Design a protein around this nucleic acid. Structure first.
Lengths: 64, 120, 61, 175, 134, 51
RNA sequence: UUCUGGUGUCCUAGGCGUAGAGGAACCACACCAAUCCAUCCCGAACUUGGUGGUUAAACUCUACUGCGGUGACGAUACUGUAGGGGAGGUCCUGCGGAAAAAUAGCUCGACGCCAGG
RNA sequence: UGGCCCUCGAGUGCAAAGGCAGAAGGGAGCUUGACUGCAAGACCCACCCGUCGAGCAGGGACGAAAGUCGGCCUUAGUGA
């Protein structure tokens, strides 16, 4: 229908802070995007947190 | 739920209101994706009077590569169903839509049936 | 001290039975709702009563 | 553009993974549907306008304020009241917003659970639901101080034990 | 004893008929008390016969009360007789026709069930007998 | 309240074939004024029968 | 002259389910776009115009009594008349009619019109 | 809000009964037949009453037409 629907643009520029640009179709023309799923720390964030931070004995030996 | 049961349910919905009489037969259509069908039938004796189809006009003007039902072959088969029952004694007829809503090629099919002076 | 005696007196029913000669306009069935649906050569009424349109017998199927 | 990535690579390995015999028996995603569960939108008139403008910029098209199916006592619900504002988008918008669930919901969730093998498991026709990301990053987020409801139901054609989970697994939904 | 919910408060009477061909058989239990005589049996005689044969078994076995009243009897007061105003919370009544099993019992030997079923048949306005599970 | 009230046409006291005022019984008007198109007046086509 | 598929009508109503088959033709889904048209949003539905592949879904045909529907005979309750018993509740006879439920079975419909090949 | 199952158990301004599943139940468009003059024949029938009605003319409403509409699914809501 006309006159009610928002402008669904085909040229939507997805800009990453790591100098990567991909094309998607959406509302805005430009999208400044953070941690988006390709090269996201979901393989290393669960490696750094809940998997390696727990220590009580090797913390004790570093002060003696 | 499905599309075919929706068409058949719409056609049974139409069939309650319109009935074939021995004075006025009823002509029903079937717009299959390859062919149209049109049936001048008489319900009180349970037999057809004047049937035509895309397999009747398709001797001269048809393209099977295209989508078979077009508005132009609806104009042509309304033309031949308008001049096929006129030579039989069928002037005053009771048209129903065949379970399909009226805004389509059944516009020019019904008006094409009106073109040869049928009392619609 | 009773809360009763509230009769109604209203009557209905089958007026013309099967295999009987009807008249044009003869009320065949007076009914509440539709126990008897209108077939052919009959008509349904304003309060769902069934009258005959033409002469002849009446049937049930 | 992920429908072209949907055509040639992730359909035939579902064709040979289940060991079919014909092409069209392989299932596909049919439609997704978003609703905004709101109990107070006749009073909050600018929250319903926030659903129209803001939620119409969340999804592809304008959403529909939903009239009440019934009236339950206790709540402020009458026959025909706005109980949530929903939208049903379909087509290439469907691929574009499951795409926006790959891009805007999978890496930007504070939780790291993703698709769940212990949720949306058993259905007659398999449906996947999420309660996440009340505002997309296209909308300036700090205006709406209310965590409004938002559910995105994906639909499929399959009636099996494997195929929808592998369908979201082949798309951008790790866990 | 008494039904909890009543679909209708007061319900008029109904006359006895021939041999009940349905409730004549024995479903549970080995022994039974078949009635030869069509009348009413209130819940009061059912409490009397139930206490009679439960305390006449008194060591083992279980009885089976078959019938439930399901209809009231409205007794008008002594208020010079014209109306059926209120008699519904008064005594309930079970219709029994001939053939019908009233009581059953199991886990009991021969003559202990003969005295158990036969003594508890004296708490009852209609002549009966005891029947073995044939 | 359910006030009974009459609809009326346009009067036209004339010497035509029985030309005279036509009022019709109607009900329910506890609202804005509703002129309905009751017709077959003394002049045979008619519309906007007022009050 | 069978199949195919629009159409009905009588119907014991013919359905669920398990199995096998059909894409020459026909019917049906699927992909592309939207000009009339359209969905309180979505070409999901409806419409128009085409690529035109499959039987996957849906239709059609053939089997099964596992459910479902239907359903006996004989009996028996009841009942019309003519009577009899009981204190009552109520029962029994002569003749006539005759159940219901259950069971043995029956049923995966039957007849016509018109257009192909 | 999405999907399967049972398929009429929901609903119909209100009491119950009889009805009604591609509906008489819910929605949307246009609407004013909630007209005029009537009316063959029936039911109910102490009388008074009361109920249904094919069909005709005028002038229309909807629909593309076929047709339908003389208030409401019906029975109560009244007074010579």
């Amino acid at each position: 229908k006309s006159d009610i629907h928002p402008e669904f643009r085909e040229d939507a520029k997805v800009y990453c802070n790591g100098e990567l640009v991909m094309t998607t179709g959406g509302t805005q023309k430009d999208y400044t995007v953070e941690v988006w799923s390709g090269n996201h720390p979901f393989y290393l964030g669960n490696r750094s947190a809940l998997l390696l931070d727990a220590d009580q004995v090797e913390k004790f030996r570093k002060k003696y | 739920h499905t599309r075919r049961e929706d068409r058949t349910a719409r056609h049974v919905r139409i069939r309650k209101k319109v009935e074939g009489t021995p004075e006025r037969p009823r002509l029903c259509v079937f717009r299959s994706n390859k062919h149209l069908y049109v049936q001048v039938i008489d319900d009180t004796k349970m037999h057809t009077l004047a049937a035509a189809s895309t397999m009747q006009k398709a001797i001269s003007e048809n393209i099977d590569y295209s989508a078979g039902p077009t508005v132009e072959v609806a104009q042509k088969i309304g033309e031949m169903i308008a001049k096929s029952c006129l030579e039989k004694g069928i002037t005053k007829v009771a048209f129903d839509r065949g379970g399909y809503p009226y805004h389509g090629r059944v516009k020019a099919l019904a008006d094409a049936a009106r073109e040869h002076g049928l009392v619609f | 001290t009773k809360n009763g005696r509230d009769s109604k007196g209203q009557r209905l029913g089958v007026k013309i039975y099967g295999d009987q000669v009807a008249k044009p306009g003869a009320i065949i069935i007076r009914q509440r709702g539709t126990k008897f649906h209108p077939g052919k050569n009959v008509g349904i009424g304003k309060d769902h009563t069934i009258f005959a349109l033409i002469d002849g017998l009446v049937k049930f199927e | 553009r992920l429908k072209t990535n949907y055509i040639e690579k992730m359909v035939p390995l579902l064709k040979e993974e289940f060991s079919y015999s014909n092409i069209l028996e392989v299932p596909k995603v049919v439609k997704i549907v978003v609703n905004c569960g709101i109990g107070d939108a006749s009073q909050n008139a600018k929250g319903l306008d926030a659903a129209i403008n803001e939620l119409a910029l969340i999804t592809g098209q304008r959403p529909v304020k939903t009239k009440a199916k019934t009236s339950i006592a206790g709540f402020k619900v009458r026959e025909g009241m706005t109980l949530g504002i929903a939208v049903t988008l379909r087509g290439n918008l469907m691929y574009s917003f499951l795409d926006r669930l790959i891009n805007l919901a999978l890496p930007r969730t504070r939780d790291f659970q993703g698709v769940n093998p212990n949720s949306f498991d058993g259905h007659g026709n398999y449906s996947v639901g999420f309660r996440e990301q009340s505002v997309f990053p296209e909308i300036k987020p700090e205006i709406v101080g209310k965590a409004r409801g938002m559910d995105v139901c994906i639909t499929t054609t399959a009636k099996t034990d494997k195929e929808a989970y592998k369908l979201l697994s082949l798309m951008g939904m790790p866990f | 004893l008494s039904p909890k919910r009543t679909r209708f408060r007061k319900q008029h009477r109904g006359r006895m008929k021939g041999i009940s061909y349905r409730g004549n058989r024995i479903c549970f239990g080995r022994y039974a008390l078949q009635a030869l005589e069509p009348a009413w049996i209130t819940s009061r005689q059912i409490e009397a016969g139930r206490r009679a044969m439960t305390r006449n078994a008194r060591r083992g076995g279980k009885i089976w009360v078959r019938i439930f009243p399901d209809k009231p009897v409205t007794v008008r007061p002594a208020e010079t007789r014209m109306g059926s105003g209120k008699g519904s919370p008064e005594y309930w009544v079970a219709v029994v026709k001939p053939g019908r099993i009233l009581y059953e019992i199991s886990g009991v030997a021969e003559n202990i069930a003969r005295r158990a079923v036969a003594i508890a048949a004296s708490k009852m306005p209609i002549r009966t007998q005891f029947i073995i599970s044939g | 309240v359910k006030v009974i009230l009459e609809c009326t046409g346009c009067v036209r006291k004339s010497v035509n074939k029985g030309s005279r005022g036509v009022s019709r019984y109607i009900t329910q008007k506890n609202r804005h004024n509703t002129p309905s198109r009751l017709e077959l007046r003394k002049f045979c086509p008619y519309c906007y029968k007022h009050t």
